[PDB]
């Protein structure tokens, strides 16, 4: 629906929507920008991610409220409404995955862009896995795993251990292990090794880079404290 708007105007409006906390608008603007067909800059990738993370995060929070109510119950209403929110969430995940597949990932040649998009792919398959119950649930989980794994392999070869996207990827892959793959020991081992290797690389960083890296290290620490 955004085909008639200039790319630069879509980007500018995404930034305005973020300031206005209008994340559905933000996501639609960034979808339109992606569909222009040009690669995304560092800042533009972050806008795309923030927009859809906020949209799907609200849907996930609602699905969890409704799923909890449904479990305490077990009329059709709670199930029906949970299913409605679930379908909407799946639609958003499918939209994001479609943007990644057509054609963000294949055009991403630099490590920073390719890891960013593969992390996104793992995340949105993870969100699909959170609600999945059918014949394809194991394949959804393995799709998340495969995307995260490719991102990890690239990040370990091409980025320093303190790189924020490498750290956030490892954080989210550890959450995948703990919550989705029922592999808490893998989750703990990944978080600990990631934290320790970043700690040993902090000395190389400027004050501003140090702030970015230690912020995500604290999230790894919070999970390790929760898990151990």
């Amino acid at each position: 629906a955004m085909g008639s708007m200039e790319r630069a105007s879509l980007i500018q409006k995404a930034k305005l929507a973020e300031q206005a906390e209008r994340y559905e608008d933000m996501a639609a603007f960034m979808k339109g920008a992606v569909e222009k067909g040009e690669e995304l800059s560092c800042e533009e990738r972050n806008l795309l991610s923030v927009a859809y993370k906020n949209v799907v995060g609200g849907q996930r929070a609602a699905w969890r409220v409704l799923s909890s109510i449904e479990q305490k119950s077990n009329g059709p209403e709670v199930r029906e409404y949970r299913e409605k929110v679930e379908t909407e969430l799946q639609g958003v995940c499918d939209t994001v995955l479609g943007l990644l597949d057509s054609h963000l990932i294949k055009e991403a040649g630099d490590a920073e862009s390719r890891v960013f998009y593969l992390k996104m792919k793992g995340d949105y398959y993870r969100y699909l896995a959170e609600v999945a119950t059918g014949d394809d649930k194991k394949r959804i989980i393995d799709s998340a795993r495969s995307a995260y794994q490719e991102a990890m392999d690239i990040s370990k070869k091409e980025m320093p251990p303190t790189n924020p996207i490498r750290l956030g990827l490892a954080l989210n892959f550890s959450v995948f292990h703990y919550e989705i793959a029922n592999s808490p020991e893998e989750a703990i081992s990944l978080a600990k090794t990631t934290f320790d290797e970043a700690m040993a690389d902090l000395h190389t960083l400027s004050e501003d880079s140090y702030k970015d890296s230690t912020l995500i290290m604290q999230l790894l620490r919070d999970n390790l404290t929760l898990w151990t």
């Binding site: 923030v50 993370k53 989210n172 919070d222």
Partner: peptide, 7 residues
């Protein structure tokens, strides 16, 4: 319950 990446 655990924290995934968030800004």
């Amino acid at each position: 319950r655990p924290s995934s990446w968030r800004q």
